[PDB]
């Protein structure tokens, strides 16, 4: 729950792990782009149907 870190190290472990998580999440972006493009296409189809 606490998720304390560096309690006895004094190294800046916390923000370091945060930066890790950021870079790791980096991997997910292309899937987001694909999803966005396809969703836009579906909305366009809806407009054409209207």
């Amino acid at each position: 729950s606490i998720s304390s870190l560096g309690v006895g190290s004094n190294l800046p472990l916390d923000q370091l792990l945060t930066d890790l998580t950021k870079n790791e999440k980096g991997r997910l972006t292309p899937i987001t782009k694909q999803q966005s493009a396809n969703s836009a296409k579906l909305t366009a189809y809806g407009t054409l149907k209207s």
Binding site: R27, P30, Q34
Partner: protein, 50 residues
């Protein structure tokens, strides 16, 4: 150069239809190549990430 026709053209509807068919064919090919290139780009993005 564009010649001056001395007579009336026969069955021009057929010629116009042939031209339109040519255009439709070319458009079909161009769309196919567009789709090919888009798929290629997506593959390249995934590959570079990996």
């Amino acid at each position: 150069l564009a010649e001056a026709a001395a007579t009336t053209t026969e069955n021009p509807l057929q010629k116009i239809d042939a031209a339109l068919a040519q255009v439709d064919t070319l458009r079909s090919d161009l769309g196919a190549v567009q789709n090919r290139f888009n798929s290629a780009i997506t593959n390249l993005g995934n590959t570079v990430n990996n």
